[PDB]
Each structure stands twice: as structure tokens, then as C-alpha cells.
Enzyme design. Structure first.
Site, PDB file in Angstrom:
ATOM      1  N   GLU A  59       0.165  -6.271 -32.332  1.00 33.12           N
ATOM      2  CA  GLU A  59      -0.832  -5.699 -33.230  1.00 33.12           C
ATOM      3  C   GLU A  59      -2.085  -5.305 -32.463  1.00 33.12           C
ATOM      4  OE1 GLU A  59      -2.049  -8.255 -36.463  1.00 33.12           O
ATOM      5  OE2 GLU A  59      -4.074  -7.409 -36.428  1.00 33.12           O
ATOM      6  N   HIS A  60      -2.495  -6.136 -31.503  1.00 33.77           N
ATOM      7  CA  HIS A  60      -3.687  -5.832 -30.718  1.00 33.77           C
ATOM      8  C   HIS A  60      -3.514  -4.553 -29.907  1.00 33.77           C
ATOM      9  CE1 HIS A  60      -5.805  -9.411 -31.859  1.00 33.77           C
ATOM     10  NE2 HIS A  60      -6.716  -9.247 -30.916  1.00 33.77           N
ATOM     11  N   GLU A 136     -11.200 -14.018 -28.977  1.00 34.24           N
ATOM     12  CA  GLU A 136     -10.968 -14.117 -30.412  1.00 34.24           C
ATOM     13  C   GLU A 136     -10.586 -15.532 -30.824  1.00 34.24           C
ATOM     14  OE1 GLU A 136      -7.812 -14.620 -31.685  1.00 34.24           O
ATOM     15  OE2 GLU A 136      -7.952 -14.048 -33.801  1.00 34.24           O
TER      16      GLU A 136
END
Lengths: 414, 79
Positions: A59-60, A136
Site C-alpha cells: 500500500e505504501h 510511522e
């Protein structure tokens, strides 16, 4: 134009099956803009400990580059059209959706295909994503609610792939090689596990043509146990206590979900600070319970009030409260489905979950079926005298011990 | 004095299992009996010797009391 009469006005979501298996679904409406997207039945629960953070990493780096156009080119093409691309990953689903205008549909779908089929995994970009995810981790450390729910999943499912976090361990993301990501893509991102869902100003045949043109090259070809454990992280310097208690709930495919939703809607924040009820659903299991913030000195009272509400629903649920819960559930459903992005997400998740887009008329008939007797029976079936899973992020000292919490799940009077 | 405010502990995380999920008698022979044996070994050489001394004193005292009341051959032999 009664509520039941008004539900029929909702347009149906046409569904088509491509040769490779990709399921194309659309809900046309007189909307100037649309939100196309690809939903994939791949999540954290399908990942082993070797590649726990594979989906989150993908996804990143999904929008950071593809073979046809570099990541900068992809982002510039998205921005110039005025569209917004977005992605999310749950433990069971993964979605990439482009929200754009109705006339921008032909490009956007192509974009999705470019993201899905041929994703360019640049090594430098991979290391950059490693660094971003490492930052993150500390970013997410602040969020108490997310930590509590991760604790709840980990303690509830333990020796099950459903218990590992979507992000994954720091070591796993640190050592997650490119070949692992490519293997994850090859073994998971394949039709028919994909739904291309769109709603709003989209004509279904147009979406089918775009999907065949772009999304047509996709290759055609453990027992989940709920352990009633608990996790208790103290960190007494934190201002307020966070707690989430749950019991095993039914999967997606179960008639009891609606009754549980009504029961949750039925469930006094005066003792608490911000108390909420959740009904997280998975394929074969689920977490049905509550989550609340507490003062350091008031955890016990809030837990008592919540469990008393549970017992009252399980044993003696009047008709007025059940009717109120049904009305609340109906309003929540209809209000949530307002908006193009919500209906597109609902279409995708429903196709990945029920195999069909359940219409609102069926939902309302099912809610009408619900009765006080049904609520009591199903609550006793799932809540009464059940070993719960508890997660507490401190300061927890007044939180009752697990034996006390478990004993609070049944009534000696009853 | 209530559980809310007793002491300040920071980032100490504990995992617990439901009483029904687990068994009441785990590791009866793998750990339990060896654990009891090691506890007995540790406490034996610090508890037993005092009572052994007590038993020796008890036996000696009883035997000496018995001897004291069964004697005096010479006391009548001179007669």
C-alpha cells in the site's frame, strides 16, 4: 414515499464476471462525479509471520511507481485530473480507489490497472518506504485507541493469523525484501479475488469495457479460535485509561449480525468519558463488544455499567428499546450509504464479503424481523456467560481482574 | 487506599489467560513434582537439623530418665 417505499428507488448495482474472474460492479446515478476502485480479498490474516507487513508495504509503495509511468508521473496524472487516489488495508481487505469526475472515468480505471497488475518496486523507493514506515510506527504509538484494538486482536486470536497487526512488527518490515513483496503480489493480487467497483456517474457497460481493456490481463489462474485472554499495558503516566472488551462474534455470513447491531445500538457515558460499542466482523469470527476511555479512578464503575447493560439486554430486553435500536440502525445504514465513496466501498466490501450486493430492502426486512425476544435470545447466545477478551492500555489498576470481569458476564439473579 | 491510586508503574505489560481456556493442573510431572522437590531440597538443610537435635535430646532424656529409676545394685550389695 414511505421509508420502505423509498428504498425501492435505490438503483441496483449491476455485476458482471470477466473471463479472468474479475468481478465488475457498478451503481449508476445522476452524479457529476464518481469513485472507481479495486477491492482485493487479501489482508493481514492471509500473511504468515515471514511477511506480516507485506500488504501495508505494498500500500505504501503502490502509488510510488509503475512500469508504464514513474511514480512522479503517476502522481502528476492523478493531480492534473483533479482526482484523489486513496488506499486502505484491513486484516481481510485491501482497496485502492480513485475518486474523480464522471468524464475522467476512462483514465482512472486504466490507472487502477496500472497500479494493480504492473507495480514497479524500485529498490530505492523500497528503502524510502522502509524509513517512512519506521517513522510511522512511532507516529502510531501516540494513538491509544489503535494500540488498544491491536492489543485486543492479539489477545483474542493469539495463535491465529487474524491476531497479527496490519502494519506488522518493526523487525519484519525492516527485513522485508523486495522478492517477498513480489511473491505476495503474485500469490495474492489475482482474479477472481478482485472486484472493480464504481458508483455515481458511471454507466455499467462503460466500466465493463474499461475493465476488460485494462484489468483484463490479470492472471486467470488455519482454524480461527477465539481465546478469552487479556493484555494489560500500564504506563501509568498516561492521562486516561483505555479499555476494550469483546466476545467472539459471528462472521460476515450470519443472520445474527443484524440483531447484534440492534443490541449495540441499544447500548450512559456519564460514568465514562467516551464509550462506544463495536461489532467488528470477519469471515468466520468477529469481535463484538465495547471500548471506552476512563478516569484513573473510574474504570471499575464503567465496566460494571457496561456489563450490566449487556446482562439486561441478554435477560430482559423490552420492546421499546429494541424498536429504538432498530430505528437507530436503519438511520445509520441509510446515512452511511450517502455519498459516492461510501457506496463504492460498500459495493466492493459486500462483493468480497457476501458475494453479492445486499439491497436496502433486504436490510430493512431483516431489521423488521428483529424482535425483543430475538434480541434476548441472540444476546444470550453470544454475550451471556462467555469468556471475554480484554485489552487495557493504562493507567489500568482499578480495572477488575480477569476473574472479576468474567464473573460479571453472568447474573446470579437470572 | 482503593485500587485506583496505590503506586506508579510504567510500561509493565502482563498477559493472562481465562481460567476456562487453560487447565487447572499443567506440568504436573514435567515441572510440578521437580519444583516441589527443589523447594524441599532448599528448605531441608535449614529446617531439619534443629528437629534432629530435638529428637536426639528427647531420646537421650527418656533413656536417662529410665536409667535413673533402674539402678542401685551396690546400694543393697553392701548389706
Amino acid at each position: 414515499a414511505t421509508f420502505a417505499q423509498a428504498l425501492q428507488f435505490v438503483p441496483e448495482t449491476q455485476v458482471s464476471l470477466l473471463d479472468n474472474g474479475l468481478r465488475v460492479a457498478s451503481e449508476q446515478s445522476s452524479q457529476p462525479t464518481c469513485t472507481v476502485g479495486v477491492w482485493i480479498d487479501v489482508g493481514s490474516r492471509f500473511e504468515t509471520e515471514k511477511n506480516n507487513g507485506a500488504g501495508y508495504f505494498l500500500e505504501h509503495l503502490a502509488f510510488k511507481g509503475t512500469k508504464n509511468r514513474p511514480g512522479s508521473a503517476l502522481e502528476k496524472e492523478v493531480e492534473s485530473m483533479g482526482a484523489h487516489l486513496n488506499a486502505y488495508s484491513t486484516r481481510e481487505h485491501t482497496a485502492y480507489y480513485i475518486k474523480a469526475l464522471s468524464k475522467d472515468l476512462p483514465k482512472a480505471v486504466e490507472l487502477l490497472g496500472d497500479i494493480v497488475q504492473n507495480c514497479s518496486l524500485e529498490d530505492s523507493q523500497i528503502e524510502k518506504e522502509r524509513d517512512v514506515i519506521l517513522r510511522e510506527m512511532q507516529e502510531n504509538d501516540a494513538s491509544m485507541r489503535d494500540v488498544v484494538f491491536n492489543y485486543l486482536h492479539a489477545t483474542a486470536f493469539q495463535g491465529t493469523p487474524l491476531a497479527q497487526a496490519v502494519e506488522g512488527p518493526s523487525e519484519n518490515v525492516r527485513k522485508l525484501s523486495r522478492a517477498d513483496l513480489t511473491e505476495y503480489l503474485s500469490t495474492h493480487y489475482k482474479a477472481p479475488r478482485m472486484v472493480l467497483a464504481a458508483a455515481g456517474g458511471v454507466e455499467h457497460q462503460q466500466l465493463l469495457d474499461l475493465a476488460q481493456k485494462h484489468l483484463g490481463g490479470i492472471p486467470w489462474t488455519t482454524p480461527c479460535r477465539f481465546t478469552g485472554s487479556e493484555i494489560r499495558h500500564r504506563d501509568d503516566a498516561l492521562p486516561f485509561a483505555h479499555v476494550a472488551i469483546a466476545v467472539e462474534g459471528p462472521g460476515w455470513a450470519s443472520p445474527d449480525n443484524v440483531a447484534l447491531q440492534v443490541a449495540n445500538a441499544i447500548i450512559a457515558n456519564k460514568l465514562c468519558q467516551s464509550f462506544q460499542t463495536f461489532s467488528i466482523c470477519y469471515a468466520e469470527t468477529g469481535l463484538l463488544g465495547a471500548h471506552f476511555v476512563c478516569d484513573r479512578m473510574k474504570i471499575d464503575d464503567m465496566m460494571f455499567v457496561l456489563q450490566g447493560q449487556w446482562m439486561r439486554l441478554c435477560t430482559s430486553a423490552t420492546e421499546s428499546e429494541v424498536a429504538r435500536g432498530k430505528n437507530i440502525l436503519r438511520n445509520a445504514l441509510v446515512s452511511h450509504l450517502d455519498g459516492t465513496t461510501p457506496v463504492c466501498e460498500d459495493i466492493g466490501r459486500s462483493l468480497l464479503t457476501y458475494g453479492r450486493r445486499i439491497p436496502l430492502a433486504e436490510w430493512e426486512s431483516r431489521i423488521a424481523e428483529v424482535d425483543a425476544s430475538v434480541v434476548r435470545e441472540i444476546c444470550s447466545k453470544y454475550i451471556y456467560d462467555q469468556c471475554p477478551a480484554v485489552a487495557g492500555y493504562g493507567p489500568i489498576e482499578q480495572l477488575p481482574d480477569y476473574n472479576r470481569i468474567r464473573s460479571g458476564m453472568f447474573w446470579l439473579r437470572f | 487506599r482503593e485500587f485506583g491510586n496505590l503506586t506508579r508503574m510504567r510500561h509493565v505489560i502482563s498477559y493472562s489467560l481465562s481460567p476456562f481456556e487453560q487447565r487447572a493442573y499443567p506440568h504436573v510431572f514435567t515441572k510440578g513434582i521437580p519444583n516441589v522437590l527443589r523447594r524441599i531440597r532448599e528448605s531441608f538443610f535449614r529446617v531439619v537439623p534443629q528437629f534432629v537435635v530435638f529428637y536426639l535430646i528427647y531420646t537421650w532424656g527418656t533413656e536417662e530418665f529410665e536409667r535413673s529409676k533402674r539402678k542401685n545394685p551396690a546400694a543393697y550389695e553392701n548389706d
